[PDB]
Design a protein around this ligand. Structure first.
Ligand SMILES: Cc1cc2nc3c(=O)[nH]c(=O)nc-3n(C[C@H](O)[C@H](O)[C@H](O)COP(=O)(O)OP(=O)(O)OC[C@H]3O[C@@H](n4cnc5c(N)ncnc54)[C@H](O)[C@@H]3O)c2cc1C
Ligand SMILES: Cc1cc2nc3c(=O)[nH]c(=O)nc-3n(C[C@H](O)[C@H](O)[C@H](O)COP(=O)(O)O)c2cc1C
Ligand SMILES: Cc1cc2nc3c(=O)[nH]c(=O)nc-3n(C[C@H](O)[C@H](O)[C@H](O)CO)c2cc1C
Ligand code: FES
Ligand code: FES
Ligand SMILES: [Ca+2]
Lengths: 412, 446, 206, 251, 408, 198
């Protein structure tokens, strides 16, 4: 009996118990398996059914289609590149020299060009799962350490941070770098401020920025976005920056990348960003449930469209990024992922309905600005979100000051 | 007309039938000392003393000249005191029908009465405590006036009684009370009501304003926000329709009128309906043989804002016109937080319940989760209709920033104005006490 | 012996950067190399000590109207001499230090000590106070520089300590230790450690 | 207090401080100039393949082995002047000493070119063995400066060192890597038709090629900068005429 | 050589030009004119000062001390003054003593108030009646082990105008005293030699000021009497010197000359019909006696009164005859005393233990309405804390708890 | 015209005086508690910088730079003393003018001038002007843009700190440590403009 066991071993963790120092973990497990069973004390004798557990679990479930398609796409890209490069004995030797490849083969998969969706998804899993496990374990260590030292209770929110961080990195990221990034994100950005609901930056993007600026060689370039040994290939946004729309060609298969390919997700990149369709399907549910901010999403779209069309009208003779339309900006890079799942973080965004529009517009403007007029970086969504996180409070301040003036006028 | 769009009508089961009937015999009544804001009693009676109706029980140290009187004639049997000897209730056992009487006037002379005479009669009869002052929701000082007196002739609290049914029985008393209020005020009297008709006073400074929409469309706070915004230098008085009827009866017959009509409703009530009771009636005796078996909570007032009626506090409040009863939700569910709740209510759309329009829930007192920090998914904006910033105001209250809360508009709010915000909080904060603490700081600092 | 207390208190008890907020610009700017941190520490110590000594020497004759002008004239003369000497004998470090050699004039520590102590104390005490404040400043500068240089380039004073992959080693340097946020984070964590080991400096809750 | 005392005090203090500061400043100028020159001399000696430790040795070897000269870019022939004290970097900014480039001509993105440049001939006795050309161009973050040593046939590179750049240490800062700099020795600047032929090969150049060097891994935007630098400075607007004169035995 | 001369000349010229420009700007911009401060709107008692400095020194220029104490760091907070003109905004550190409500009537701390223009002032309590007195020591006897009874004469038949519970300011010149010079009798010397308290000495080379309570009610004409406690160094670090003014006072004897000043008070009693309870300890006997005598002999009020005093032993209690005479002449007052350490020679049979516990267990626990009483309290801080806690747990409000904490 | 707009945008966003060059950090950290106080201080910084940079440009071009006064004579070693004296005298004179003639402008911004009479931000701005060799109009625009960027950064920090009223910082980090960490995160966010070749 799980209930009997849980309510029997409770005394070991109460003050004076044999395991009193692990009470936080004990209560975490107890309230994960069963509900608190508490009642109300004051004010409203009846409460809404929603809680942080459901709020976080819904967001966690919203990214499952993106995760699965990302694994499948990573496997397919890797297999295609491997078969493009090597053949016969060379391919056999290459497979024997990589544990991902020979494990895929051992578990019943095939590394040949006629591999199926099962083999491709297995190959994607042998890359995604280790990263996610490392991120989760390392971040949970710090969360539990802080909760024990400051005698708090472990809460939800890292359950989303870990997966979002794991889904926005290249398939080939080293595990120690992943651990360092999650440590930075969890500790420096969130925990020192008091934990969930008390910070001001985005914990997931803060760690990604740490990786970006500390080890740029492993999170940029042509060597990291396809998990094929010895394969070098550019991606869509870089190819556009080089030679316009005509430069979008998949060198592994010699085909031309189309808008439908970019929309569905048949392109290289971060694990979970590629599928705009899957991201839309996931985000629709949480927008309907009232967890995500349609105002923020609309502001992002408005800013992106406005700035992209302004650049299109202005034109340029030497910068090919000036003629990328809004519907191409939408399906490339991490724009969709960021807009749907990272620009909507309730804690880091503005707390006012009017301020949310400005916050989204700023994010959308900055993303396109960094994409176009910044030659160093091909993408700018992470940087734009981190930038707008600094100025959301000022939008809130402006709205609040206008409201206070209205009040002083005896109309509020 | 003013129409409220942001709000919530709680679909709790057990809606009363709007028909009045005689209630259970009441043998004990009491005055609750902790329901008056900032009150510090000075006892005038001791256990075993006999009292007459409208005889004084205690005064207020912090508000000189205000008297709290007995609702019935009888004997004082208990004087309950809690931690730090704070008075909890003075209990009187009903016996006899002796009373203190006052001056009486004709119906047509009430509008021309003198303000000082009206105030003297009200203070002496103890009916002066029906009024409350925004800000701070305190009994007004006997030497002060206000330009706006707000009469509440509507009720949108869940399971509440319909004011029209009660008023239609006491039309003359209601009109007389409105005339007395028109004489008492220095500006206007605002009669807030719904679209239906009520008896009208013919005085030019008595005005009817219709409000439409869900809760809190019927709150004096909303009425003040829309008709006469309040501040430190603009103070309004609030009073409900039954107290107006009581004032009319007082000035018509020279006798304190302590009859009441309250709504007895809830998921566990066999026959929800309206019952005739008396002020301060014992709720344990009122609900006898009325509830289903099991562990239940008896609430004086609404489930949104009310007092747990247990032990020394088991008596009808001064400002409450209903009694709510519901089960205690002490059950533990296996992965209950992850179920596809068809029988779970929420202002969000994460549960299957919202797909069944018109559904009614057998709600309990359980808290559907543990305490957490605030994650503003925007629930407060769905329920706050006033021109404010709900999330920022609530965060100021949580942080204890009294000055910022005052700037954001804490002075316009009562505990019952944040009941829905407490209801829909994922973090399970209780904002009423935070608001009360902030207001206490503001009042203490002068 | 009173001298040791005067010279040592500003190191941990009254650290100019960790308890007082002074001299943060140079601490953020010149701590990507230990040699530059060391040279800046020495220069600040020298300038502060001599400015204190002279200001205390002429404290009774400074006109109140232009006291700021007099103090800044002394400080600027000392800083100009230091800058010339550095360009004459330490050209490389002078190039690396850039505009921050001239910013010693506006370094808050020098003026703060000149106003607070030199104007009210004797010459030798003022000189010792300047030396102590210089040591306190150098403590933070060198502590930050050690971590930044080591974890960003595998070097200390330019000497190889951690072999690099580019040279065939085993260590991959951290790129963020050569940028602005690293100094902020390191100073914050140093303040955290200092106020953990000496809780009397903890600030009250607002 | 009185303005008389105020003025007396400030005047005396100003006299003392000004005497000290002016004497110190004017007494060290020559040593500062020597320190400034030594840094450039060391890099020139390094790229020339001459080893030297200490200021004394650096000066001693530079004086005898290196002969600075001025060159006219338009006609590629020597000009008279104090080459040892010429400052091409500021000469490029002066309107009376530089020309504005055209969008098509400005391949390296320098926006201006000085009328006359400076080259450092390397001496073996009276005979001349090498000529060192200063070149520069825009990278991804900063303006990159380098010396390139060319033999007396005007085609063969003897060495290359970047002495001023601000690229990222990991990706673009590898222009200073000894292993990458070693690849340049023995390469030919021009093809058999005398067109520029230096190529920065993406992904690595084939072994045995006489014109290709490996590009910077993961740092294309800087390899493009190097390629543009050489494309511009080996063309007509750079050392083209000078190098054809050198090929014709002008040295 | 030329460059050195040019540098010297240019440095001197630049610095001199800047100095001259700033001096000219100052002479032409700063007012430099005299300004006037007036009190209560009168054309008399006004002051004229330079446009600068603190308000407290300008007021002291006319002898208006505003009951200042400790003169620094806002330690006392007694220097409040009301400003009636368009003055400046309050400094942030005045809020520690002045509440938000008080800030709206113009209350400000004279220490923190700077002046650069004309302004109007309103002085509370009409402190213009203050006077300085020259007095002759009558008695400096030891009524207990560590408190000394000081008695002073008033010349020319005068009598200080004061209210019961008030205090006076004591001013002393530069002095040097040693504890071995004290005349402590043998009954109290037993502890002084036990702790070797004669080791101590103190000195000061500039005049000092202190405040002390007054131990006689208004109609006890012709004399000012006080109870002064010897201020010894803290026991955790007893190497520091003792107090100054108390040590100076303990060296006096009959016939010595002394000066008193600054009669003020804020510890007055309220005029109601409510019962009064007095709690005293150690030095606090003076204001308790003052209040009791004022209430019983002058006013002859019929309010119920009681006094509770905590002591160590029988050799530490005094005014026994006075309080017994009061309790015998009128029955509206009752005196109770509890001593912590009953020695064998005491033959004690009365209450023991701490005064708060004795009071709670004997009187208050059975009181019909303890919240309706008025509590007047003086004594050591660690007794006041316990008494306040005990009263608070009974539901007594701050409005009815009147405290006079010596030293803050 | 595009040249001056490019200069202004560069100064405000690309080369931010506060977060990119680390100048004025003592005051930028100490006076960031309240948005309005930070706003007033930033306005004062804007005014002082935009008045100071052009005047120092004039003095440098007319006296200090080589061969400015006499052929073969250069007095560039007086740069520090001249600049600091000019700034110090000018700030006091402006404060005094506001005090005498404009009591309301004094209450608004003049009360902050004592903090900035001698400040790393202004001195480094003048120093960078000297290195970059700006014209008079370029100096005016550069000073205005640097002041505006510094105001923007300090106001953003003040807004973040006001938002942090709900935070729960460890006792050892309250104040200086957490503000340092917040400033580091702000710089991390501001690095988005690093590669812009404006
Ligand atoms: C209205 C009012 C009424 C008062 N009435 C009375 C009264 O009736 N009786 C009475 O006794 N007091 C009374 N006081 C208290 C009195 O004013 C002083 O608090 C003190 O009692 C005066 O003693 P003193 O002047 O001898 O010593 P002070 O010098 O005033 O006391 C200084 C204390 O600090 C210690 N000290 C000095 N230097 C150091 C150091 N470096 N480190 C540590 N400790 C140090 C000294 O040893 C001594 O204990 C009253 C105060 C007020 C405000
Ligand atoms: C949420 C998110 C944010 C990102 N932010 C950045 C960024 O700020 N800068 C960047 O260079 N790449 C960023 N990336 C990575 C790119 O979107 C992309 O995956 C990668 O640069 C591959 O090259 P491409 O953009 O040309 O396809 C981000 C990815 C995600 C999912
Ligand atoms: C709609 C939604 C989006 C979220 N997005 C993020 C995110 O992008 N990154 C992250 O670390 N946490 C995210 N969280 C979790 C949490 O809100 C976040 O870590 C807070 O900043 C913690 O205080 C999200 C939560 C919700 C409900
Ligand atoms: S602002 Fe203080 S050292 Fe720069
Ligand atoms: S000395 Fe009394 S307030 Fe300053
Ligand atoms: Ca050139």
């Amino acid at each position: 009996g799980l209930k009997k066991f849980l309510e029997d071993i409770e005394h070991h963790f109460e003050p004076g118990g044999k395991h009193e120092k692990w009470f936080a973990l004990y209560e975490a497990a107890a309230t994960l398996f069963y509900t608190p069973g508490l009642v109300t004390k004051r004010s409203s004798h009846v409460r809404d059914s929603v809680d942080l557990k459901r709020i976080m679990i819904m967001v966690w479930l919203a990214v499952f289609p993106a995760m699965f398609w990302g694994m499948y796409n990573a496997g397919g890209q890797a297999i295609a590149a491997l078969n493009h490069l090597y053949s016969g004995d060379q391919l056999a030797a290459i497979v024997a020299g990589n544990w991902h490849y020979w494990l895929t083969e051992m578990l019943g998969g095939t590394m040949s060009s006629d591999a199926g969706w099962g083999s491709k998804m297995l190959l994607g899993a042998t890359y995604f799962l280790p990263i996610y496990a490392t991120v989760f374990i390392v971040g949970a260590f710090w969360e539990v350490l802080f909760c024990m030292v400051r005698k708090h209770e472990v809460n939800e929110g890292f359950f989303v941070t870990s997966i979002l961080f794991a889904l926005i990195v290249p398939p080939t990221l080293p595990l120690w770098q992943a651990a360092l990034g999650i440590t930075f994100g969890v500790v420096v950005a969130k925990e020192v401020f008091g934990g969930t609901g008390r910070n001001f930056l985005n914990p997931a993007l803060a760690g990604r920025a740490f990786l970006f600026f500390a080890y740029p060689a492993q999170i940029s370039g042509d060597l990291v976005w396809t998990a094929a040994d010895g394969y070098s290939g550019a991606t869509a946004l870089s190819q556009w920056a080089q030679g316009g729309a005509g430069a979008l060609i998949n060198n592994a298969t010699g085909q031309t990348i189309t808008w439908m390919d970019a929309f569905i997700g048949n392109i290289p990149g971060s694990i979970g960003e590629v599928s705009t369709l899957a991201l839309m399907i996931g985000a629709a549910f949480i927008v309907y449930m009232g967890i995500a901010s349609w105002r923020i999403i609309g502001g992002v779209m408005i800013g992106m469209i406005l700035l992209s069309t302004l650049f299109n009208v202005i034109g340029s003779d030497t910068n090919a990024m000036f003629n990328m339309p809004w519907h191409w900006h939408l399906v490339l890079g991490g724009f969709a992922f960021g807009m749907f799942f990272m620009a909507t973080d309730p804690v880091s965004a503005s707390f006012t309905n009017s301020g949310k529009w400005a916050y989204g517009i700023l994010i959308g403007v900055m993303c396109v600005l960094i994409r176009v007029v910044n030659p160093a970086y091909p993408e700018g969504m992470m940087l734009a979100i981190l930038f707008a996180n600094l100025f959301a409070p000022l939008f809130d301040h402006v709205v609040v000051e206008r409201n206070i003036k209205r009040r002083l006028a005896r109309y509020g | 007309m003013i129409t409220i769009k942001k709000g919530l009508d709680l679909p709790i089961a057990g809606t009363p039938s709007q028909v009045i009937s005689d209630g259970k015999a009441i043998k004990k009544v009491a005055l609750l000392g902790e329901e008056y804001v900032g009150m510090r009693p000075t006892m005038h009676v001791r256990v075993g003393d006999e009292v007459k109706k409208a005889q004084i029980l205690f005064e207020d140290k912090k508000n000189p000249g205000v008297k709290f009187t007995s609702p019935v004639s009888g004997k004082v049997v208990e004087i309950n005191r809690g931690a730090k000897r704070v008075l909890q209730s003075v209990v009187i056992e009903v016996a006899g029908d002796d009373q203190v009487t006052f001056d009486k006037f004709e119906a047509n002379q009430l509008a021309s009465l003198n303000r000082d005479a009206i105030k003297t009669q009200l203070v002496e009869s103890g009916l002066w405590t029906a009024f409350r002052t925004r800000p701070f929701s305190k009994v007004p000082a006997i030497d002060s006036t206000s330009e706006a007196i707000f009469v509440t002739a509507m009720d949108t609290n869940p399971l509440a009684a319909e004011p029209t049914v009660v008023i239609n029985e006491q039309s003359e008393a209601f009109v007389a009370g409105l005339d007395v209020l028109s004489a008492l005020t220095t500006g206007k009297v605002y009669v807030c009501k719904k679209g239906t008709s009520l008896p009208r006073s013919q005085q030019p400074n008595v005005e009817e304003h219709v409000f439409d929409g869900p809760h809190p469309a019927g709150l004096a706070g909303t009425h003040m926000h829309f008709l006469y915004p309040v501040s430190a230098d603009h103070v309004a008085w609030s009073i409900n329709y039954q107290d107006v009827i009581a004032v009319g009866q007082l000035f018509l017959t020279g006798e304190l009128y302590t009859q009441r009509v309250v709504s007895l409703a809830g998921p566990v009530v066999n026959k929800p309906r309206l019952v005739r009771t008396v002020m301060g009636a014992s709720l344990e005796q009122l609900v006898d043989s009325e509830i289903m078996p099991g562990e239940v909570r008896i609430i004086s007032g609404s489930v949104l804002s009310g007092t747990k009626a247990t032990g020394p506090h088991a008596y009808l409040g001064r400002y409450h016109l209903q009694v709510s009863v519901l089960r205690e939700g002490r059950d533990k569910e296996l992965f209950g937080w992850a179920m596809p709740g068809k029988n779970k209510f929420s202002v969000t759309r994460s549960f299957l319940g919202h797909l069944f329009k018109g559904q009614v829930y057998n709600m309990t007192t359980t808290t559907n989760g543990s305490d957490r920090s605030m994650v503003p998914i925007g629930n407060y904006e769905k329920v706050m209709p006033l021109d404010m910033e709900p999330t920022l105001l609530l965060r100021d209250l949580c942080a204890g920033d009294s000055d910022s809360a005052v700037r954001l508009g804490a002075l316009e709010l009562d505990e019952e104005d944040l009941a829905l915000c407490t209801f829909v909080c994922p973090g399970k904060y209780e904002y009423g006490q935070l608001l009360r603490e902030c207001l206490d700081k503001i009042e203490k600092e002068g | 012996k009173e001298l040791k207390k005067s010279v040592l208190a500003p190191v941990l008890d009254n650290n100019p950067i960790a308890l007082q907020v002074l001299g943060v610009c140079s601490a953020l700017a010149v701590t990507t190399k230990l040699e530059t941190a060391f040279v800046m520490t020495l220069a600040v110590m020298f300038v502060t000590a001599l400015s204190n000594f002279f200001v205390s020497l002429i404290r009774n004759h400074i006109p109140n109207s232009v006291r700021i002008i007099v103090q800044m004239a002394i400080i600027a003369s000392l800083v100009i001499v230091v800058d010339q000497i550095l360009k004459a004998y330490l050209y490389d470090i002078s190039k690396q230090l850039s505009v921050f050699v001239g910013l010693i004039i506006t370094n808050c520590i020098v003026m703060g000590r000149a106003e607070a102590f030199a104007m009210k104390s004797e010459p030798i005490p003022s000189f010792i106070d300047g030396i102590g404040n210089g040591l306190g400043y150098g403590f933070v500068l060198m502590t930050v520089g050690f971590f930044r240089e080591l974890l960003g380039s595998g070097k200390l004073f330019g000497l190889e300590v951690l072999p690099l992959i580019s040279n065939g080693g085993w260590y991959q340097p951290n790129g963020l230790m050569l940028l602005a946020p690293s100094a902020f984070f390191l100073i914050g964590f140093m303040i955290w450690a200092i106020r953990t080991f000496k809780p009397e400096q903890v600030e009250a809750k607002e | 207090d009185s303005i008389k005392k105020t003025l007396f005090v400030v005047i005396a203090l100003s006299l003392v401080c000004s005497i000290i500061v002016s004497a110190a400043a004017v007494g060290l100028r020559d040593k500062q100039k020597e320190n400034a020159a030594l840094d450039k001399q060391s890099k020139i000696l390094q790229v020339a393949g001459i080893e030297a430790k200490g200021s004394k040795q650096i000066v001693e070897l530079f004086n005898k082995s290196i002969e600075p000269r001025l060159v006219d870019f338009n006609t590629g022939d020597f000009v008279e002047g104090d080459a040892a004290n010429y400052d091409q970097r500021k000469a490029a900014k002066e309107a009376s000493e530089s020309i504005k480039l055209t969008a098509e001509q400005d391949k390296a993105k320098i926006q201006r070119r000085a009328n006359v440049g400076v080259v450092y001939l390397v001496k073996d006795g009276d005979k001349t063995s090498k000529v060192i050309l200063p070149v520069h161009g825009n990278g991804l973050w900063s303006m990159m400066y380098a010396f390139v040593a060319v033999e007396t046939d005007g085609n063969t590179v003897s060495g290359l060192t970047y002495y001023e750049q601000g690229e990222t240490p990991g990706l673009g800062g590898e222009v200073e890597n000894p292993a990458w700099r070693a690849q340049w020795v023995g390469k030919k600047l021009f093809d058999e038709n005398h067109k520029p032929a230096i190529k920065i090969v993406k992904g690595g150049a084939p072994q045995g090629s006489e014109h290709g060097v490996d590009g910077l891994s993961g740092a294309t935007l800087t390899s493009n900068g190097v390629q543009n630098t050489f494309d511009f400075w080996l063309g007509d607007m750079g050392f083209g005429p000078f190098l054809t004169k050198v090929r014709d035995g002008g040295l | 050589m030329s460059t050195i001369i040019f540098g010297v000349v240019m440095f001197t010229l630049i610095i001199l030009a800047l100095v001259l420009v700033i001096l000219f700007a100052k002479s032409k911009l700063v007012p430099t004119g005299d300004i006037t401060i007036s009190i209560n709107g009168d054309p008399e008692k006004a002051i004229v000062t330079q446009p600068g400095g603190k308000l407290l020194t300008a007021l002291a220029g006319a002898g208006v001390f505003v009951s200042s104490a400790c003169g620094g760091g806002g330690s006392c907070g007694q220097c409040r003054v009301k400003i009636k003109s368009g003055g400046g905004d309050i400094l942030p550190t005045e809020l520690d003593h002045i509440s938000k409500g008080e800030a709206r009537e113009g209350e400000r701390l004279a220490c923190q108030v700077a002046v650069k223009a004309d302004m109007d002032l309103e002085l509370p309590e009409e402190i213009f009646g203050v006077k300085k007195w020259e007095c002759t020591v009558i008695s400096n006897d030891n009524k207990a082990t560590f408190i000394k009874e000081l008695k002073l004469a008033i010349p020319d038949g005068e009598s200080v105008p004061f209210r019961a519970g008030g205090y006076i300011q004591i001013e002393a010149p530069a002095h040097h005293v040693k504890y071995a010079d004290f005349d402590v009798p043998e009954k109290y010397r037993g502890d002084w030699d036990k702790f070797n308290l004669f080791r101590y000495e103190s000195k000061v080379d500039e005049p000092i000021i202190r405040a002390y309570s007054m131990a006689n009610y208004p109609e006890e004409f012709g004399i000012i009497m006080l109870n002064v406690r010897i201020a010894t160094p803290p026991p955790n670090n007893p190497n520091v010197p003792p107090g100054q003014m108390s040590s100076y006072i303990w060296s006096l004897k009959a016939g010595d000359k002394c000066t008193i000043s600054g009669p003020f008070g804020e510890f007055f009693a309220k005029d109601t019909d409510a019962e009064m309870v007095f709690i005293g300890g150690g030095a606090g006997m003076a204001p308790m006696r003052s209040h009791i005598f004022d209430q019983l002999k002058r006013l002859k009020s019929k309010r119920k009164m009681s006094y509770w005093y905590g002591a160590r032993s029988k050799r530490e209690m005094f005014y026994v005859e006075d309080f017994d005479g009061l309790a015998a002449e009128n029955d509206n007052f009752v005196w109770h005393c509890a001593l912590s350490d009953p020695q064998p020679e005491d033959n004690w049979t009365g209450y023991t233990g701490f005064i708060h516990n004795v009071l709670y267990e004997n009187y208050l626990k059975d009181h019909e309405a303890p919240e309706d009483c008025e509590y007047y309290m003086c004594g050591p801080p660690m007794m006041n804390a316990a008494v306040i806690n005990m009263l608070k747990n009974l539901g007594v409000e701050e409005e009815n708890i009147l405290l006079d904490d010596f030293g803050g | 015209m595009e040249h001056y707009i490019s200069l202004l945008v560069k100064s405000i966003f690309i080369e931010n005086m506060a977060l990119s060059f680390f100048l004025g950090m003592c005051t930028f950290l100490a006076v960031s508690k309240k948005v309005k106080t930070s706003f007033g201080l930033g306005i004062a910084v804007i005014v002082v910088l935009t008045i100071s940079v052009p005047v120092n440009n004039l003095v440098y071009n007319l006296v200090l730079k080589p061969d400015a006064l006499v052929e073969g004579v250069d007095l560039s070693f007086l740069n520090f003393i001249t600049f600091i004296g000019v700034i110090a005298a000018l700030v006091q004179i402006l404060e005094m003018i506001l005090d005498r003639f404009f009591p309301p402008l004094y209450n608004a911004l003049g009360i902050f001038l004592p903090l900035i009479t001698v400040n790393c931000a202004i001195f480094g701005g003048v120093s960078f002007m000297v290195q970059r060799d700006y014209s008079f109009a370029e100096s005016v625009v550069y000073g205005f843009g640097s002041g505006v960027g510094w105001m923007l950064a300090i106001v953003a920090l003040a807004g973040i700190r006001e938002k942090m009223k709900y935070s729960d910082v460890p006792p050892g980090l309250r104040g200086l440590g957490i503000t340092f960490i917040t400033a580091g995160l702000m710089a991390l966010g501001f690095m988005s403009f690093s590669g812009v070749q404006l």
